[model samples]
Target: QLDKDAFEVLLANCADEPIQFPGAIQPHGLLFTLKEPELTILQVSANVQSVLGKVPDQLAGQTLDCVLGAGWAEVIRSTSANDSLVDVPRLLMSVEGVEFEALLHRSQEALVLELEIQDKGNMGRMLRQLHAAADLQTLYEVSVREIQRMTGYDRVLIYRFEEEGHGQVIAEASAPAMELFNGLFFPASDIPEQARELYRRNWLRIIPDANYTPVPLVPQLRPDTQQQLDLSFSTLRSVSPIHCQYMKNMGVLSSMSVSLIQGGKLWGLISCGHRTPLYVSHELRSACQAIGQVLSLQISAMEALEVSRQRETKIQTLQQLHQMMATSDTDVFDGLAQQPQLLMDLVGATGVAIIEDRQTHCYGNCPEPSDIRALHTWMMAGGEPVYASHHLSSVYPPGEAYQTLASGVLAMSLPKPVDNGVIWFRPEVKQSVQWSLRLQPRTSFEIWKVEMTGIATKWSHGDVFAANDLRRSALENDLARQV
Candidate 1:
């Protein structure tokens, strides 16, 4: 075990390590970097002898057809149109009586061709299952089990990102009698900033065996530019030593991660672990990648549907709230008071208040009237118009006195006096739910920003508009009652 300081240093070092341009690859697959259009073999994996019966020295600087046969060279030419990092079912190449599936993509000035053994998995079944999942939680549970079945791994988990960027194993499926990591939260440091970005860009990552030796690339550098190879998309890219140690620490000999991206952001991961050494075929890996993608789309679609439903509810409620103030012959304050809850419901807040002059009327879980008075005074100074704060204590320091009562506030000043108004508040939950340097700031009428802090839920522009409408109805009703 390392000391705290030592661990920090180790993590920093690991993050700084150039895993992308590492001059090697995992031994499970073979790599051949070829010159564009000419098909000249510019680089080869050190383990090339095992497949072609020829050493790297003999293969370097030679035409690809001379070793892999002219038939394969022509077959590869057919794939020149698509530069995407994808492999087709029939990309099989037989060299020296051994079959190897080819994965071709462009890296640096060379076109990289990677060869791996492949298989056929039930990817479509998983897709259908994921598509049919009704909610986000159930969708996660379904994904882990299907991936575990597809890969035959000992344990599978859906690792989700939580507030503050930590990871939590929200759902897990494991072999019978295996320990479960469900609901376990891991620190954010487990994945560095650089690692997260890589995970975002790449959909699938795998480690078939944690203890395998890394095969070095021939020539140790690209012959054209003499720079280390960029293996960001290489299927055979070597695993980082620190990551290998982490898998060992978890007592797993093999692992895989399929990134779950939603709305162009990484939402979570489908992680698989094995007790003993395991090797998942390229085909199964692709299946996991597809499952992740389908799951992401389903998540986006479901969340969108839920949002549409909520928006519709708000629209109807706003209309009803307006109708009450519009048609009621009673005092505008009394009319709104009749539906105290409606004021809160309109903007999804926990408390509400109607201020007539200096007099304050409150409902739900609001702060004391005395506490509200000071806040009202400050808001009135600026002549409020649909103002809101998820963190009220941020702009007005005295708001700290009632942070829990109204940490999130939405207020609208009435017409005429511009002081009397309605205010809504949401409490701090018992159950949990950019910097820029510029010109110097002086007292010369310079535009500035204020920093205030308190925890509160987000309110969007739609909520702001709704609050504005709430004020309008009250003002209109008041004029009619006066008449």
Candidate 2:
């Protein structure tokens, strides 16, 4: 691993790139900043001559009708009234004869309109096809394939962000001749925090050519703000120059990505890579954007259902345990011992210890009775009813002595049995992760494997919920019998 200086340098440099105010737009399209109801152009991309045969100076002071030639002023009135043309547009009125579709959004000071030539791609049917996916794997596969089909990128991949700030190619689709990268691991440094925020704010972005130069805005900075334009939502915004270099390093000449956002966070990305310069039309990009949202919605539903299905069995087991604890004449520890596996399975813990009046009951794999008693002593020194951790030693240094087991811990305490509680354990599980060079130009894409330890499979929120649920019933059962 790199030293502190190197590591901090890498993090600060990547995150410090203020990509949102790049002061430029990608070369493929044109940009216009308008001043309010008058629709008078305030500024334009310097590349206007290349995109529309009109110079920036000619367009700088003109009204919307002056540049678009008529009927456009009314279109603006209808759309920008209460905000219909937001976030990639409810498509928006394409200025037909002029042959460009508009991406409309209001920046802090001006109404920005970005223009790109349109294409017609069927999106409704694509949404239907995506919904038709029977399972999660199939859904991921379908999304990659659909993105590839729409953009014709040589390779399409769905990269899921995972624990430890790493990423994996979960699903992929590529032309037969393309190199395979379906299972390759990518380092977190490959996409720093600031870059992630951009994708979170804008669902889609594209690079027509990794080698293309950024076309600067005509005046560079807005006069009012004296700062670069905030192109956070600009579909034509050029990425960080560093990002461009990174793309070229990957041997990718053209690329596009649509973010998969769920629960107000970026969950993953649908990435399309081309070995040659490739520009997907604005229409196709819009379709991809819609597809991204559809996939994000379904990911939560599909995974949530699977989670519920798994929890259903746990609930059934708890009902059985609850029955014995509540109504039976058996001792609480005895009833728990009646079904050891159910007790462990309740939280998927490999081991459990229930101590009543200093008598110990343990099931499956666990620490020595002396070790558990010491842990309970330390825990009960406080009054918290519940405590949980996936890595025991982080909070309890003494736990490192028995790291082979009991690495994951969840404990629940009841009121009646003062200084008494239940603790569960899971074995240590070390994981190997492959990381890329922190933040430098690299010649190799070879795997740099690192092993991670001192942890176990995490205890889910449901696990905690189950533990608390058991405590309530446990409280009622013990109090009634004592009375």
Candidate 3:
């Protein structure tokens, strides 16, 4: 066995090899140098030259301030000290007021710096990408390519949530050598319900190397209260065995994820993946993460626009219906009942059902009046409007009144004294479940069934949950009461 000190010295020397000696040396030739630290040049690799205009010798022994100037040096020192050295990108120096990215590191005796100078013009392209990322589909596409480029992963994808808190790969990036990933959908159940909940609670989440032991969380002096305790922040935390197994099963040896939040909810994940076991440097991770955050915000903005557009469309539909109702001089129920499809179109519902005094009147491709009644009762009994996560059998009262009308339900109170509201349902379960039934277990059939479809893949009672949480914390249970 090699001497521990010698081995460490050798490894460090190897790490610095490309810039250590004036000329290149074979791997075996440097073995003897392991015995002598004095002979080790301990130079930064040429990769440093790619980042910074200067080499290691230029900045060594001098305070980083002397070379980068006090202002630049201070910025680099402070940011790196506060953030995890891994994958965090910081602006080390600036020309005029524009901050320039500098890969800064604190060595045992001095500060190491790498100034990014390659295709600096690409910054414009990045900005352009950010600007266009306002659409979710567009944002999803760009994010996949960005992650793949940033991490050089074999595959990169935008994995979305399912109603069951599962995730499906909605977009993907693949290498030339890789096979096509045209139809692939992983069950939300694959992530386990608990993990999905945690993901929902936090904003961005990451996993560097799947096989590596996780860093554990240090016990806090005080029990946690308002602050969220996420495993992503813990250095001593280890990889979840379940997640590891999940990745392994997917043939992924390493992975990193950054959650994309939309409307204050966990929307989806930008997943960077490597087929073979790989290790991501903290610096690289941070750089990717910084970019990921910027990208996510852009993505969120884009999705928000979609939401606004949808609301507008809903309003337009409602207006049209209202106009018809006004002309006909009929009750709101009759007006709504006239075109059941109109009701569905107005609210983006797969089905619509109306309930009054426990009697049911239903139209559209949604749940039955019984289900609507159950939902109404639940809502009236203090359940708030929410994003549905899964099909809830108990959500509606029985009597075959509604056969789980839609895979997902969206319940919102009627505008006023109508005391009756609308329940919009998506026909995802009707579609996906029926398709999955024909497929053999563990076969690609289920994947085919789920992957071929989109939209309803991740409906949730999120809206309801948020509304309820708001009500529970307030002095009253109703939305009107809370105000």
Candidate 4:
């Protein structure tokens, strides 16, 4: 068993390992390299007999016509000459009752040809189901269900990345026998910076069989560049052995991930896993990629709608609170004191205090008079008309003793003549949070126990806006009285 310090070092080392040019591929499919224009085979996967009925030794140095026939070879040559084949997958041919799809791309002097058994179908129903979703959570639930049904994977999950790059399994669809991983959090190191960048560039990645032997390229270096072949965009690119071991640790035999991009940035992933070897056709994978793009757009739209609605509701509530204070005949602080619930409700606070003319009127779960005086003195020195703290104890040490009554605080100073303010409070809350170890989960993870003291519920933009609006209203009312 490794200690935390040792584990951290191990994780850092694994992340730094270069995984792009493994010069090999999993044995699920065949990879063929052909010299451009002439279309002559330069290299082939060692396991080509299972798909093309030819060995690597026989296939190398042979023309495309000798392997896939003259008609199919001409079709590929014509397409390559016309335009770029970076992302497009073309149906190469049907031989021995098996249809094959080919993805072609340039790698220095060679044209990399990736072949996989084709399985094509319509995803109209799935798109319709996603279109009918009412919210972001519903969209994810529908997406996972459709993907699981189409691909026959044991589990399909929507793993969303937070601002900190940590990922959480927000929604899941799994076979009844499988254990639930929903709400599980994985650290950012699980998918390091470079890995995430690759996902962003290439939207889809797959490992048909984690335990399969990797077939090495015939010539490891590019003939033209004399450097290792760049397979960043190759569909047949081999995955890192460490990642394969990580999969085995989780008991996953096959896995696939589709990047969910929002505003040209990677938002999250549609992670799929199977308990046994499973090979999905390139066409089917393309359909899954389409769903990911649609889901990204829907999430962005839904979140914007929710924010607008919340802002409108808060504005209306602020207007009502302002009207009540304006109608009162008493002074600003006294008027606010009579309607303490309105002020508290505006900011979603449990307690409120009105301080004016060196006097304090408290309501709900507030601190004692002496403690309030101490807090007031601290705020006065800051010279800010508005002040707020989620953890008051950090700013005012005396607050630690009375944290249960008041931990978080939001205050707005009154204008001239009174030179006082209004403050709202919330008590401390304690809980536990789960965090993933790193990239691999060979050992148990650490669950942090959060014992929060002298802290309260954090304030929102709406809360700050409401507080400022009330302060402005009081100032305007005082000016009218003086006039």
Which pairs clash in the backbone of model 4?
none
| Alpha-carbon shift of residue 217 in model 3 (angstroms) | 14
Count clashing pairs, candidate 3. 35
lDDT of 2 by residue, 1-483 (tens): 456566455446675777788888877777888776677777788776664566567666667676665786667656666674544354444443446767788898688887765544367777888889999999998888887887788888898876665667889898887567755665676787878898899888788787877788978766656777788888888877666656666667888899999887878899888889876765677778888889999999999998998789878987889777655555755677778888888988778888766576888776778877787877645457788877777778787788777777888877654556777877765433332343332322232222224567678888888888887877777757667
Regions more than 4 Å wrong, model 3: 1-123, 162-164, 176-237, 261-266, 281-283, 329-333, 352-392, 397-426, 430-483
lDDT of 1 by residue, 408-435 (tens): 8888877665446788888763223211
Tens digit of per-residue lDDT, candidate 3, span 1-483:
566566445444432232211221111001000001121222223322323345444432235444346775456546655474565744544543334446544333323344432122444566577677645677768767866776788878777764545455678888777545533555544444445555555444444456654221112111212221222222213444445555766667777777666666666777777878565554666666666667767866766677677656655665566555443433345565678887666545566665556466666564445545555666655454443524443443442244334555665554455465645566654354432221212444365455433334344233343334322322122343223
Off by over 4 Å in 2: 1-11, 49-99, 117-129, 161-169, 176-190, 325-331, 355-370, 380-383, 398-404, 415-420, 427-436, 439-458, 478-483
Task: Write down the lDDT of every candidate, Cα atoms only.
Answer: 0.74, 0.74, 0.49, 0.74
> Candidate 4: misplaced stretches above 4 Å?
1-10, 32-72, 86-89, 94-100, 106-111, 117-122, 328-478, 481-483
Worst 10 residues of 3 by lDDT: 26-35
TM-scores of all predicted structures: 0.78, 0.78, 0.51, 0.75
Reference-based TM-score, model 1 = 0.78
lDDT of model 3 at position 115: 44
1-483: candidate 4 lDDT, tens digit per residue: 456566555556677756667788766556777777688877767666676676566566678787778888898888777577745645667655667677777766578887765644458888789889997788889889988888888989888886356666789999988667766756666677767878888889998888877878766654545666667777777877667768887778899899988887888999899999888876678788888888888888887798777778777777776566666556665667777887788777888877665576889976777777777778655657678887877887676778777777888877564456788887764322343323344232222112244546567776787778777877777656455
